[PDB]
Amino acid sequence: NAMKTYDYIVIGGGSGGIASANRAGMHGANVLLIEGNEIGGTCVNVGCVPKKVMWQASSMMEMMERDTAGYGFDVEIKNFSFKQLVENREKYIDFLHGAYNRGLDSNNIERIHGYATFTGEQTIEVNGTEYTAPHILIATGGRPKKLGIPGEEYALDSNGFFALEEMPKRVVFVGAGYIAAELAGTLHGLGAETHWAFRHERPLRSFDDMLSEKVVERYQEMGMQIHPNATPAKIEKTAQNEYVITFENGESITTDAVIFGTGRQPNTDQLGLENTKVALDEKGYVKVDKFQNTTQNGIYAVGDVIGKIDLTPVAIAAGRRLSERLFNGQTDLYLDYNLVPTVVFTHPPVATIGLTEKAALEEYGEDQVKIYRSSFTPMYFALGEYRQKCDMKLICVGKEEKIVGLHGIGIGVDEMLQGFAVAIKMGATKADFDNTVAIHPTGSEEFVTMR
Amino acid sequence: KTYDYIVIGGGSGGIASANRAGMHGANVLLIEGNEIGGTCVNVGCVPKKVMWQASSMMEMMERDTAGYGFDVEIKNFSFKQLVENREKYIDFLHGAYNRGLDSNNIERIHGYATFTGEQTIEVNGTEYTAPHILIATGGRPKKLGIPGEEYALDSNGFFALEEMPKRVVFVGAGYIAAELAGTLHGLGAETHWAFRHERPLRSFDDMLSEKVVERYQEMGMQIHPNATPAKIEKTAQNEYVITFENGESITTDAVIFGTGRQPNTDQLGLENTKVALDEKGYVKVDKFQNTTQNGIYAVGDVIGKIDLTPVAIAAGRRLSERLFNGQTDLYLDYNLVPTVVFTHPPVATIGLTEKAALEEYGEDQVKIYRSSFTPMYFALGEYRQKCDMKLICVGKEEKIVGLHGIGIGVDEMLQGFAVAIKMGATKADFDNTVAIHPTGSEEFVTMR
Ligand SMILES: Cc1cc2nc3c(=O)[nH]c(=O)nc-3n(C[C@H](O)[C@H](O)[C@H](O)COP(=O)(O)OP(=O)(O)OC[C@H]3O[C@@H](n4cnc5c(N)ncnc54)[C@H](O)[C@@H]3O)c2cc1C
Ligand SMILES: Cc1cc2nc3c(=O)[nH]c(=O)nc-3n(C[C@H](O)[C@H](O)[C@H](O)COP(=O)(O)OP(=O)(O)OC[C@H]3O[C@@H](n4cnc5c(N)ncnc54)[C@H](O)[C@@H]3O)c2cc1C
Ligand SMILES: [Cl-]
Ligand SMILES: [Cl-]
Ligand SMILES: [Cl-]
Ligand SMILES: [Cl-]
Ligand SMILES: [Cl-]
Ligand SMILES: [Cl-]
Ligand SMILES: [Cl-]
Ligand SMILES: [Cl-]
Ligand SMILES: [Cl-]
Ligand SMILES: [Cl-]
Ligand SMILES: [Mg+2]
Ligand SMILES: [Mg+2]
Ligand SMILES: [Mg+2]
Numbered sequence A: 001n002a003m004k005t006y007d008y009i010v011i012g013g014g015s016g017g018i019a020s021a022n023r024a025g026m027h028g029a030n031v032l033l034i035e036g037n038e039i040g041g042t043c044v045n046v047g048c049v050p051k052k053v054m055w056q057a058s059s060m061m062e063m064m065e066r067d068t069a070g071y072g073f074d075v076e077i078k079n080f081s082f083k084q085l086v087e088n089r090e091k092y093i094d095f096l097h098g099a100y101n102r103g104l105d106s107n108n109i110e111r112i113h114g115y116a117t118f119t120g121e122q123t124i125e126v127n128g129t130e131y132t133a134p135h136i137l138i139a140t141g142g143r144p145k146k147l148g149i150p151g152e153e154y155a156l157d158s159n160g161f162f163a164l165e166e167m168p169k170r171v172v173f174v175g176a177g178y179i180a181a182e183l184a185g186t187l188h189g190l191g192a193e194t195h196w197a198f199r200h201e202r203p204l205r206s207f208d209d210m211l212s213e214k215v216v217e218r219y220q221e222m223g224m225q226i227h228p229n230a231t232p233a234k235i236e237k238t239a240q241n242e243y244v245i246t247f248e249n250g251e252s253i254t255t256d257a258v259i260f261g262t263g264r265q266p267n268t269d270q271l272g273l274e275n276t277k278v279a280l281d282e283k284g285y286v287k288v289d290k291f292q293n294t295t296q297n298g299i300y301a302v303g304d305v306i307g308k309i310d311l312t313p314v315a316i317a318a319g320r321r322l323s324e325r326l327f328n329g330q331t332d333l334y335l336d337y338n339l340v341p342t343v344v345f346t347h348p349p350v351a352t353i354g355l356t357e358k359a360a361l362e363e364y365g366e367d368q369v370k371i372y373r374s375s376f377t378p379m380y381f382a383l384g385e386y387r388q389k390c391d392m393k394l395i396c397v398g399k400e401e402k403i404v405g406l407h408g409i410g411i412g413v414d415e416m417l418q419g420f421a422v423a424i425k426m427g428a429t430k431a432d433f434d435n436t437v438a439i440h441p442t443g444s445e446e447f448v449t450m451r
Numbered sequence B: 001k002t003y004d005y006i007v008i009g010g011g012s013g014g015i016a017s018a019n020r021a022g023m024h025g026a027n028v029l030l031i032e033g034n035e036i037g038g039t040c041v042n043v044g045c046v047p048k049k050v051m052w053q054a055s056s057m058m059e060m061m062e063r064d065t066a067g068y069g070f071d072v073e074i075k076n077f078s079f080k081q082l083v084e085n086r087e088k089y090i091d092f093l094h095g096a097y098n099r100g101l102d103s104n105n106i107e108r109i110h111g112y113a114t115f116t117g118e119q120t121i122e123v124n125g126t127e128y129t130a131p132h133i134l135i136a137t138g139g140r141p142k143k144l145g146i147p148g149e150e151y152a153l154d155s156n157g158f159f160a161l162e163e164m165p166k167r168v169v170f171v172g173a174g175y176i177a178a179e180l181a182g183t184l185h186g187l188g189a190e191t192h193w194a195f196r197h198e199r200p201l202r203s204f205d206d207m208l209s210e211k212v213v214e215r216y217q218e219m220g221m222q223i224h225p226n227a228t229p230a231k232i233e234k235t236a237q238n239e240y241v242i243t244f245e246n247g248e249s250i251t252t253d254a255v256i257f258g259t260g261r262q263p264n265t266d267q268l269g270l271e272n273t274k275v276a277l278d279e280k281g282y283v284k285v286d287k288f289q290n291t292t293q294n295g296i297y298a299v300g301d302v303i304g305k306i307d308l309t310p311v312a313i314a315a316g317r318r319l320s321e322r323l324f325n326g327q328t329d330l331y332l333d334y335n336l337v338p339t340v341v342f343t344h345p346p347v348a349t350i351g352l353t354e355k356a357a358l359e360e361y362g363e364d365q366v367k368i369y370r371s372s373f374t375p376m377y378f379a380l381g382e383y384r385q386k387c388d389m390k391l392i393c394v395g396k397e398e399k400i401v402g403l404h405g406i407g408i409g410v411d412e413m414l415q416g417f418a419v420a421i422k423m424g425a426t427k428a429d430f431d432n433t434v435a436i437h438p439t440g441s442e443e444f445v446t447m448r
C-alpha cells in the first residue's frame, strides 16, 4: 500500500527518457521508466528510423532509374513491393525494441507499460499503483496536431503515413516543414504522382533561403508538382474510391491519399500537472531553465515536450547531462542549444548549422557579414545527362571571418556535416577551413576551397 | 626566350602553381610532355573515382535492393560504354584546365623538358630561361622486374582498358592495388589480391588494414598474403599463370600491379644544376619547396612527401604566393593531411596510427576510443557490413592525434573532422558537439 520508492522516475520511454534512465542507472540510481506505448518512442517507431529507411528506398529507386545508364548499366526494376519494404522496415524496428530493452536491462532499469499521471509533487500513478521519487523526469514528447478541415478523417498524419502497407498512385502532401518535405520526396522517389502544397510562396521558411529555394527546385526538376500559396479548404471522398482536396484559391487535386504535417503538440494534457508546481507555456510546453529544471524543484523535463529543438540527439544529450548532474555530481553541467546541426533528408539532402543569411545580416549588419557561395555538379553526375547541382554557403562575420552559419544541399551532405559542426562549435574561421588540406575527389572538399 | 617562371609538368602541382603565378602577373611557361592535368585527371583520382562509383552501383543493385523490396536485373553491363563516358568527361576536364591556363596568360609547350644549365631548360630542341623554375614532374609506376612482367598491367595499363578481364590478380600492398581490386571485384571480376607480407596497407592504422581485408574477403575476394611474385607465363589457351615464391599459382586473364612509384627525375638533366636528390631519386626541398639550388623549386609527387593531389596543389599555390605575391614566410604544413581510400567500403584517415601514437607518446598517455556498428543502410538485408571507427587521444586533455574509419559514407565524413583536428580538437570538443541522427557520422561524436 505504501508508495514504492525509487531514486528516479522517468515518464516516457522515447529518445530523452531512455537516454536519461540509462545514464542514471549506470551511476547506481534505482530507476523506474514508464512508457505507455512502445519502447524507443517517436524516433524508433514512427520517426527518424522508419523515415530514413523509406528515404533510402526512394533514393535507390531514383539512382536505378536515372543514373545507371551513364555508368554502362541497362537495369530493369522487374518489381517493387512497397509491402515488403514496410514489412522489412517494421522487422528492423522490432529488432531495435530488443536492443533498447537489453540496454535498459544492462543498467538495471525497472519498467512499466502504461501511462503515468502526477498525483502529488513527487508522486505518480500508473496502472493503479503509486510510485515516488525525489527526482522525476517528464520526457513525454509530442504528437501530431489535427488538420482541422472538413474531411480530415480521410487524411493521414505522419503516423498514418507509416501505417501504410501499399503505396498510393497519387498523393498530396500538405505542410511546409521538414516532415512534409522529407515524406513527399520519399513517395515521389518511389514512383507516386506527388503534389506538395504549402501556405506561402515557399516552404521551409525557418531554413536559409538557399535551402528552401533549392529543395523546391530540385524536387520540381524531378517531376514533383509544387503548389505554393495553397491553403487547404476541404477533402471530399467521391463515389469512384478516390479523394478531391480543394484549396481556398479554388485549385483542386484528385488523389488517392492526403498526408499532412502541420505541427506537433506537447504531451502535457492529462499528465496531472495541476498536482505539481510545474508551469506550462501557452502552447503547453514545459518551462525549463538551462539545467532542465521545471518550475518545481524535483521535476525535470527534456526533449520535444519543452518546445526547444525537436531532435533526437538533443533529447538524448539533455537527458544524459541531466543524469550526470543529478547522479554523478556534475552540478554545473548543461546542454548548450546553440549551433546544433540538422540534416533534412530531401532529395538530395540538406545540411545546416548556425544562422541563416538573413539572420546574420540582422544580427551583425551588412558591413560585418561576408558570404561564400559555391555551386558545382558532383562528379557522380558527370557521365549522365542529368546534372544535379550541389549548393553550399558559408556565412562569416567580422575581419576574422568567423563562421556563424554553414548550409548545403547536395548528394552526400548528410554525412559531411558532423565534422564541420565540431569545428564551428570550436569557433572556426574561414582561415581554419582554408588551412585544412582538401580531400580529393569528394563533395566535402568544396567547403574548404571556397573563394 | 625568357620568362619569369618556368613550370615543368602540367599536372596537379604544376597547373596550380602556374595559374597562381600568372594570376599575380608573372610571365609563365608551362611544359607538359603528355596530357594536361597529369596523373590525377588522366590516370589517377578522377578515373579511379568514376570506376569506383560504377563498382559501388553494381554491388548495391546485386546485393542490397531485395531488402528494400526491389526485384532488379542488370540486363547488361558495358564496361566499354563506362570507359567511353569516363574519357568523355576527362576530355571535358582537359578543356576546362586549358581555359583556366588561358585566363592566367600561361604559355604552354607540348614536350619533355631537360635542364641544360642552372636556369635553362631544353624542349623540342629549343632553350628557354627563367630565374625561377618549378620541378613538378611527378612520378610513374615501377616495373614488376620478373619474368613475364610485360604481360601485367600497371595502373596506367588499368585505365587504358576498354574491357574488363573476367578473372584478375592484383599484386601489391598499397592503396592503389587495394582500390583497383575492389573496383573490378564490385564490377563482377573473379578477383584475387596478392601481397608480400601478412597484411597489406602497412602504413595505415592496423584497424584499417585488417578491416579492408576482412570486408573484401566477406564479399568473395580471394586474399593471398605472404605472396611474392615470381613469374608470369602465357599459356597456349591465351590465359596467364602467375606464380609466387611460396609455390602458389593462379590462372587468370590479367595481372594488375601497384608495387610503388618512382620520381620523374632520372631523365631531367639535373646533372646540369645544383639540385640534389635523395637516395630514392626524390628532389630534396626545404619547408618552402626550395631545392638545394636557389632559383629551382619542387612540389608534388616528385618530392616524395605526401603523394596526394590537394597537397601538390596547395604547395604549388603557396609557392607562387611566396615568389610572386611577396608572401615571404608562407609554406604548406604537411602534418595532419586527411586521406580517403576508395576501398569497398571506403577508408578515412588523418593523423597518427595507434602504433605511431604509442611509440611517440607512450602507453600511459594514449587513450583509444573504438566503435563498431552496422550502418542502418544494411538493416533490411542479410549482409550486415560493419563500420569501424577509432579515435586516438593524448594526455589528460585527450587531444585527438589520430582519427580512422572504415565504412559506408566515411569518404564524405572526414573533411569537417580534419578541420577540427587541425584546430587542436580534444575528445571534449567532439563530445560537446550535438550528434546528427540518423547518420554514420554521429558515431564519431558519441564514442565512450
Ligand atoms: C516523421 C518524423 C521524422 C523525424 N526525423 C528525425 C530525424 O531524422 N532526426 C532527428 O534528430 N529527429 C527526428 N524527429 C524528431 C524526433 O523523433 C524527436 O525529436 C524525438 O523522438 C523526441 O524524443 P522525446 O524523448 O522528446 O519524445 P518521444 O521519442 O516522442 O518519446 C515520448 C514517449 O513518451 C510516451 N508517453 C507520453 N506520455 C506518457 C505518459 N503520461 N506516461 C508514459 N508514457 C508517455 C510516448 O508513448 C512516447 O513513446 C522526427 C520526428 C518525426 C515525427
Ligand atoms: C591510381 C591512382 C589513384 C590516385 N588517387 C588519388 C586520390 O583519390 N586522391 C588524391 O589526392 N591523389 C590521388 N593520387 C595521387 C595524385 O594523382 C598525385 O598525388 C598527383 O597527381 C601528383 O601531382 P603532381 O603534379 O606531383 O604530378 P603529376 O600529376 O603526375 O604531373 C606530372 C606531369 O609532368 C609530366 N612530366 C614529367 N616529366 C616531364 C618533363 N621532363 N617535361 C615535361 N613534362 C613532364 C607528366 O607527363 C605529368 O603530366 C592517385 C594516383 C594514382 C596513380
Ligand atoms: Cl542510452
Ligand atoms: Cl503549409
Ligand atoms: Cl536566408
Ligand atoms: Cl509537422
Ligand atoms: Cl589552378
Ligand atoms: Cl606487396
Ligand atoms: Cl601502405
Ligand atoms: Cl596501428
Ligand atoms: Cl603503387
Ligand atoms: Cl563501397
Ligand atoms: Mg511494430
Ligand atoms: Mg494546449
Ligand atoms: Mg607570357
Ligand SMILES: [Mg+2]
Binding pocket: B149, B150
Ligand atoms: Mg622486361
Ligand SMILES: [Mg+2]
Binding pocket: B188, B189
Ligand atoms: Mg557476374
Ligand SMILES: [Mg+2]
Binding pocket: B114, B267
Ligand atoms: Mg633524355
